[PDB]
Amino acid sequence: GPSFPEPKVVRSQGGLLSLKLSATPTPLAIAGQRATLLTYGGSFPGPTLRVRPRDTVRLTLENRLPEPTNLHWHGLPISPKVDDPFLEIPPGESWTYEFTVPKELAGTFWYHPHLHGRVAPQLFAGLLGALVVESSLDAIPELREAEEHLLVLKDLALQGGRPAPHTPMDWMNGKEGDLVLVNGALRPTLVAQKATLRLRLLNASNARYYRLALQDHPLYLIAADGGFLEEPLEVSELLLAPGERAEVLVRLRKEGRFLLQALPYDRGAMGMMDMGGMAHAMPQGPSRPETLLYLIAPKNPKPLPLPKALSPFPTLPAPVVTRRLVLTEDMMAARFFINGQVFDHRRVDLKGQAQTVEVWEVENQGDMDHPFHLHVHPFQVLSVGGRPFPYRAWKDVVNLKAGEVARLLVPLREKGRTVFHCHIVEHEDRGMMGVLEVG
């Protein structure tokens, strides 16, 4: 019947997903418009890779961009010798990422550029795609009959048939676009056929937040960035910061057409006033509400019961180290710091021990939200703003509002050199990143 736009899915076959992906300028039609974006595999979003734990992924990235790039397997707890953020793939050159999917992993992940200084333009232009890890838990009766869909939330601005260029204000704020798209389409309609939906949600935007709400419906959170919750958590709305993912169940209990919306949200984005001879940041205030899609329930909907439980969160050793990481900004210079320093790929900032557990206290001493991301080592958010976190699940991005402290339980897994940074990728490019070495 009706065809909701969703990225094409490449599945592993016989334990192997082998794929060649070109990063290339791509003439496209989207939102009733012609524009040339940067894409992987010629699609915006890029293709969804779908794997199982212990599959081998062999992705050869061919750089057909006029500038160097690389890949980050966002959220995958794999060796930084594979997920190497320091690697530069020159134009015309290629690189083959090979890794084995970790053994008990489940959920929605994604891939995107990670060459320092070029992440924000390259991501904004369209370079992103999803990776879905199937789980034995998906076979339980309360999940195996749900209708599954991926929603890639990513906004865009267009100027002269190209992605709009980054202005000095964009480097300060992180760039939001006026086209608020789902899976590259403007306000699509999803016509459900089963009464229980599993929606895999990905915020692949540079800086835009999505305060998600479905008319007349709660959402049952069942997974965070990097794995299942212990049990479904009913919520009335769900904030997704840049880089975060979530999976929710929607129980359609009556016929109709329902709007999925991004409600107003104030992330601390700023205008600028130049008066006298002095410049001053000025709060932009909350976002305008946005319709993301229209959801239409099937005939006579009979949703099944929720799963009573999902996946028990592992027991972890007591931490041996607590670290303080302070985020700050020089807004008018569009410079961003951790512990008073900007990123220097030459400089190692934290050195920890593999197979130990640390507590990281991340403190936002700036004026904007900063969503803090760590590679390689998924963490358990213990508290934010002094309030205990409402569920247990692996996460790899945590949003910090101005003034907030997050306490994170960080088990150090794979050895090697990796990074942590703000996932407003303009801030990352402008210095809000540090280096962690695990030995």
Of 370, 392, 407, 430, the one binding Cu ion (CB under 5 A) is 370
| Closest to 119 measured CA to CA, from 386, 394, 431, 336 | 431
Tokens of 378: 């998924």
CB of 399 to Cu ion, least distance (A): 10
Structure tokens at 247: 């999976």
In whole angstroms, the minimum distance from the beta carbon of 355 to Cu ion comes to 23
User: Least distance from C-beta 364 to Cu ion, angstroms?
Assistant: 9
Q: Is 149 among the annotated ligand-binding positions?
A: no
The total number of residues shown for the chain amounts to: 439
Residue 235 identity (one-letter amino acid)? V
Binding mask 225-254 vs Cu ion (x if CB under 5 A, - otherwise)? ------------------x-----------
State the nearest-atom distance from the C-beta of 258 to Cu ion, in Å. 30
Local structure of 3: helix, strand or coil = coil
Is 116 a known ligand-binding residue?
A: no
* Under 8 Å between Cβ of 376 and 413: yes
Q: Is 166 annotated as a binding residue?
A: no
Q: Which CB atom, from 73 or from 258, has the smaller least distance to Cu ion?
A: 73
Tell me whether residue 21 or residue 197 sits nearer to Cu ion (CB atom): 21
Is residue 217 annotated as involved in ligand binding?
A: no
Please tell me the distance from the alpha carbon of residue 428 to that of residue 408, in angstroms, as a whole number.
20
Known binding residue 74? Answer is yes
Q: How far apart are CA 51 and CA 112, in angstroms?
A: 17
Q: Candidates 76, 422, 435, 438: give the one binding Cu ion (CB under 5 A).
A: 422
Residue with smaller CB distance to Cu ion, 296 or 332: 332
Q: Under rule CB under 5 A, how many of the chain's residues touch Cu ion?
A: 6
Which residues inside 54-113 make contact with Cu ion, applying CB under 5 A? 74
Distance CA 303, CA 196 (A): 5
Q: How far is residue 123's CA from residue 109's CA, in Å, rounded to a whole number?
A: 15
CB of 421 to Cu ion, least distance (A): 5
Least Å distance between CB 405 and Cu ion?
Answer: 16
Which residue type sits at 299? K
Contacts of 188 (CB under 8 A, 6+ apart): 4, 5, 182, 293, 294
Site string for Cu ion, 151-190 (x = CB under 5 A): ----------------------------------------
Q: Which one of residues 198, 245, 395, 427 is an interface residue with Cu ion (CB under 5 A)?
A: 427
> What is the closest distance, in whole angstroms, from the C-beta atom of residue 245 to Cu ion in the complex?
10
d(CA 21, CA 368): 35
Question: Which of residues 123, 424, 435, 438 is near Cu ion by CB under 5 A?
Answer: 424
Q: What letters, b where the CB count within 10 A reaches 16 and e where it falls short, cover 196-224?
A: bbbbbbbbbbbbbbbbbbbeebbbbbbbb
345 is in an annotated binding site: no
What gap in Å lies between CA 293 and CA 190, rounded to an integer? 7
Which residues participate in the annotated binding site? 72, 74, 112, 114, 280, 370, 373, 375, 421-423, 427
Binding site for Cu ion (CB under 5 A): 74, 243, 370, 422, 424, 427
Mark the binding-site residues for Cu(2+), compressed into ranges: 72, 74, 112, 114, 280, 370, 373, 375, 421-423, 427
